[PDB]
Amino acid sequence: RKTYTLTDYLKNTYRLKLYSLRWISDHEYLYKQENNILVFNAEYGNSSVFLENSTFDEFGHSINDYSISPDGQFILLEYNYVKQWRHSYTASYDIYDLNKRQLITEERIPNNTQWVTWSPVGHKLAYVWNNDIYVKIEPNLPSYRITWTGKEDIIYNGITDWVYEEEVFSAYSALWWSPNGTFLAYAQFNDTEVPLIEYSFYSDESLQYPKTVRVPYPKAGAVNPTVKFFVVNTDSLSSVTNATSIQITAPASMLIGDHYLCDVTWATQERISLQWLRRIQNYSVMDICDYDESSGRWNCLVARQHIEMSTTGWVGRFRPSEPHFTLDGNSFYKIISNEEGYRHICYFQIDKKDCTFITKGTWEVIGIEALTSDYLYYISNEYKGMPGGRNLYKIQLIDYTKVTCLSCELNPERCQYYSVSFSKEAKYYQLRCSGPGLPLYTLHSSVNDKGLRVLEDNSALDKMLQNVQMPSKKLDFIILNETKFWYQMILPPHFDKSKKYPLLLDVYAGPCSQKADTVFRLNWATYLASTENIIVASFDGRGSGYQGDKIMHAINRRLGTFEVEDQIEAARQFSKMGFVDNKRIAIWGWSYGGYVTSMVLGSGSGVFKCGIAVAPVSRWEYYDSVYTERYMGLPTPEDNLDHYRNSTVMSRAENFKQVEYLLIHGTADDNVHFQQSAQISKALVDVGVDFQAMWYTDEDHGIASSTAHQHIYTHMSHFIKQCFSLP
């Protein structure tokens, strides 16, 4: 048989099939098959054509995406997609009347639109163009301008700035419609005093002079953006007068200093909840605000405030959790770390500070997935005590002891990692199994949790992989100080414990990272194992997530310490296993993992022959405020400046003499600025250490254009193969 080759990985030869559906009610979903949109009845599996592919055969633009209005009356068509940062982009939009069969030609959505969204019910539109908000009541009618303060790189109304996009909301959107669309809530960010990161963009060969890209980006300790929050009533908008936006100000506990808006969740038609986080991210407050029908204002009663703090670290995994409100809005369920530091579901009454934990144990809840009148549905890693597995559970709102695992025993050898998609009122759910075996998508009914049918079993891919010498995956743990620390290994085919193999350590090791899991992947590690016979291992030490706060907070204010030492120790335990070749152990990572690779290579352990750092952080003062400060505090003498200075890659330059190093970075990286790698190379040069390097002209943090992606993986394969003496 043949092996899974680099070409197979770079050309996507063996494709993973998915079953991406969009729910449209509590009994029907839409499914895009052969470019045509089908509407499926969930109970009987019968289909009808919703939108036939030929409809737009004369549109004249390639359509990137689509979005049907909740009432199914109109379809929004996305084209001219232009990527900005990780989540952002701009686009052109066209509106089609699905009943009249007419494209909207007057009062259109402008070109270079930043964000657009339908109301949760009906067909109102809200959009952001030139950093201002606009609302369309009817797709054929002129838009009402909501904001007038919009200014590129300065004022953002209803869109996020670089740092909130990346670190807080993981989205460009800063617009939140009320459940029935009466109100439109939005945030406004002000970057006036945020310093700019400047870098050269070379563009096409014809560009005579390079362009300087300038982005407001706050590095650790710098002046941060300010935020304001507003609510406009879209039902009282006028063609003759400018819109009235009511401001909801942050509480006094937050107003005394630098802070962030970290969550927006509507509770009812007249009740909105907001979470605010201090710049020192171990203290947060939730305001529960109500609309006053008689005054037009929004009252956040001090009696409905909920405080959340951490004595051992920061609040939340990456931010405070979102609340899941009951229909009356008088109570909510929220993931909170308990007295033992394990993240569990807490039940709050809006007027009561103390909550009741409805789950418990030495395992964590990952997310609350659906809340109904009788049950709360959640994902957790409780099953077989495996932190790297995922399963759906349901718990009875009137009896916490009434827990049922809905996914645990459906296909236990194939499916140990699930995600779920519930119908509009949770009558049905799609289970998405993603490992250890081939992905499996199934449809279920919540009536009595019974399987309806298999949506996608990846039989086509299984037929293909039967003729390929595929690698296997081992998931196990080592015991350190009477604590379990899990690892995974991508093992070559026909693996023999009596033979010795080179080993590559694939690192992330960031706070709340998890690199040891039950997910099935087709990646670079598949090629290295299948073709090159390299063991590709990953380890979750101190600072990794989903195992409790004693493990996750262990690196609080001390990045570049325990998580680094634990990767070295892991490799020691691996080498001192009879199938590893101690002379050929390598380490690699991208992003935070690039940082840990570099720290490991500069540690003087003598364990690693060689390593690759792709776009690494080198010093924490160069990275953004929101992420860095969460774990490190402020880079001031009064706070944590001493550890900011003690945890640089540069300080370890002399030790790189003991290793072969490949340093890679994209020149247009807006995230981990090229500066970071430019500072590593200069430190290496200053102590006279030889190393290998590669820059990627105009590539960002992803190094993801078709040609650069192919080049980096080809270049890296050569480096590893030469290090491991492979032909």
Ligand X SMILES: *[C@@H]1O[C@H](CO)[C@@H](O)[C@H](O)[C@H]1NC(C)=O
Ligand Y SMILES: NC[C@]1(c2cccc(Cl)c2)CC[C@H](N2CCCCC2=O)CC1
Ligand Z SMILES: *[C@@H]1O[C@H](CO)[C@@H](O[C@@H]2O[C@H](CO)[C@@H](O[C@H]3O[C@H](CO[C@H]4O[C@H](CO)[C@@H](O)[C@H](O)[C@@H]4O)[C@@H](O)[C@H](O[C@H]4O[C@H](CO)[C@@H](O)[C@H](O)[C@@H]4O)[C@@H]3O)[C@H](O)[C@H]2NC(C)=O)[C@H](O)[C@H]1NC(C)=O
Which residues in this chain contact a second copy in the complex, by CB under 8 A? 195-200, 202, 205, 208-210, 212, 219, 221-222, 619, 621-622, 648, 650, 657, 667, 673-675, 678-679, 681-683, 685-686, 688, 690, 692-698, 707-708, 710-711, 714-715, 718
Q: Is 170 near ligand Y (CB under 6 A)?
A: yes
Task: Kindly state the smallest distance separating residue 575's Cβ from ligand X, in Å.
Answer: 17
Q: Is 166 near ligand Y (CB under 6 A)?
A: yes
**Of residues 31, 318, 357, 691, which one binds ligand Y by CB under 6 A?**
318
Instruction: Give the Å distances, CA to CA, from 443 to 107, 383, 418, 460, 588.
Output: 41, 21, 13, 20, 39
Q: Is 167 near ligand Y (CB under 6 A)?
A: yes
Q: Is 633 near ligand X (CB under 6 A)?
A: yes
**Of residues 192, 404, 459, 523, which one binds ligand X by CB under 6 A?**
192
Is residue 138 within 8 Å of residue 54, measured between CB atoms?
Answer: no
Q: Contact region for ligand Z (CB under 6 A) — 36-44, 349-357, 507-515, 520-528?
A: 36-44
Q: Is 311 near ligand X (CB under 6 A)?
A: yes
Task: Kindly state the smallest distance separating residue 215's Cβ from a second copy, in Å.
Answer: 11
Q: Is 627 near ligand Y (CB under 6 A)?
A: yes
| Site string (210-249) toward ligand X, x via CB under 6 A | -------------------------------xx-------
Is residue 581 within 8 Å of residue 549, measured between CB atoms?
Answer: no
Partner that binds at residue 367, options ligand X, a second copy, ligand Y, none, CB closer than 5 to 8 Å by kind: none
Which residues, other chains included, contact 726 with Cβ-Cβ below 8 Å and sequence gap of 6+? 502, 532, 720
Q: Is 149 near ligand Z (CB under 6 A)?
A: no
Partner that binds at residue 627, options a second copy, ligand Y, ligand Z, none, CB closer than 5 to 8 Å by kind: ligand Y
Q: Applying CB under 6 A, what is the total number of residues that bind ligand Z?
A: 6
Widest distance between CA atoms in the chain: 83
Task: Kindly state the smallest distance separating residue 515's Cβ from ligand Y, in Å.
Answer: 12
Is residue 723 within 8 Å of residue 586, measured between CB atoms?
Answer: yes
| Site string (555-594) toward ligand X, x via CB under 6 A | ----------------------------------------
Task: Kindly state the smallest distance separating residue 639's Cβ from ligand X, in Å.
Answer: 7
Q: Give one DSSP letter per residue of 496-546, joined into a string.
A: -TTS-EEEEEEE---TT-----S----SHHHHHHHTT--EEEEE--TT-SS
Is residue 40 within 8 Å of residue 490, measured between CB atoms?
Answer: no
Is residue 556 within 8 Å of residue 39, measured between CB atoms?
Answer: no
Which residues, other chains included, contact 138 with Cβ-Cβ below 8 Å and sequence gap of 6+? 123
Is residue 573 within 8 Å of residue 565, measured between CB atoms?
Answer: no
Q: Contact region for ligand Z (CB under 6 A) — 40-48, 293-301, 310-318, 549-557?
A: 40-48
Residues 472-511 binding ligand X (CB under 6 A) are 480-481
Q: Is 396 near ligand X (CB under 6 A)?
A: no
Sheet of 89-97: strand order equals 65-68, 74-83, 89-97, 102-103
**Of residues 13, 18, 35, 44, which one binds ligand Z by CB under 6 A?**
44
- Say how far apart CA 13 and CA 255 lie, in whole Å: 55
Partner that binds at residue 196, options a second copy, ligand Z, ligand Y, none, CB closer than 5 to 8 Å by kind: a second copy
Q: Is 76 near ligand X (CB under 6 A)?
A: no
Lookup: tokens for 155: 């004022």
Active site residues: 591, 669, 701
Which residues, other chains included, contact 580 with Cβ-Cβ below 8 Å and sequence gap of 6+? 500, 501, 503, 535, 574
Task: Kindly state the smallest distance separating residue 233's Cβ from ligand X, in Å.
Answer: 9
Q: Is 192 near ligand Z (CB under 6 A)?
A: no
CA-based nearest residue to 71, from 114, 27, 120, 111: 120
Which residues, other chains included, contact 91 with Cβ-Cβ below 8 Å and sequence gap of 6+? 64, 78, 79, 80, 81, 82, 113, 116
CA-based nearest residue to 191, from 229, 148, 227: 227
Q: Is 48 near ligand Z (CB under 6 A)?
A: yes
Q: Is 44 near ligand X (CB under 6 A)?
A: yes
Cα-based angle 489, 494, 496 (whole degrees, multiple of 5): 70
Q: Which is nearer to a second copy, 549 or 699 (CB)?
A: 699
**Checking DSSP bridges between strand 183-190 and strand 226-233, what pairing results, if any?**
antiparallel
- Say how far apart CA 375 and CA 277 lie, in whole Å: 30
- Residue 242 CB: number of other CB atoms within 10 A? 12
Beta bridge partners of 186: 175, 230
Q: Is 401 near ligand Z (CB under 6 A)?
A: no
Task: Kindly state the smallest distance separating residue 33's Cβ from ligand Z, in Å.
Answer: 14
The label of the residue with tokens 């300010």 reads 226
Q: Contact region for ligand X (CB under 6 A) — 14-22, 188-196, 427-435, 606-614?
A: 188-196
Q: Which is nearer to ligand X, 92 or 530 (CB)?
A: 92
| Site string (61-90) toward ligand Z, x via CB under 6 A | ------------------------------
Q: Is 33 near ligand Z (CB under 6 A)?
A: no
Partner that binds at residue 685, options a second copy, ligand Z, ligand X, none, CB closer than 5 to 8 Å by kind: a second copy
SS3 612: strand
**Of residues 5, 25, 36, 47, which one binds ligand Z by CB under 6 A?**
47
- Say how far apart CA 318 and CA 334 lie, in whole Å: 15
- Say how far apart CA 276 and CA 185 lie, in whole Å: 16
List for the chain the helix, strand, coil content (%; round to 5): 20, 35, 45
Q: Contact region for ligand Y (CB under 6 A) — 60-68, 126-134, 142-150, 166-174?
A: 166-174
CA-based nearest residue to 64, from 76, 79, 75, 53: 79
Q: Which is nearer to a second copy, 372 or 710 (CB)?
A: 710
Footprint on this chain of ligand Z (rule: CB under 6 A): 39, 41, 44, 46-48
Footprint on this chain of ligand Y (rule: CB under 6 A): 166-167, 170, 318, 510, 591-592, 617, 623, 627, 671-672
Footprint on this chain of ligand X (rule: CB under 6 A): 39, 41, 44, 46-48, 92, 108, 110-111, 148-149, 155, 180, 182, 190, 192-193, 241-242, 269-270, 280, 282-283, 309, 311, 480-481, 542, 633
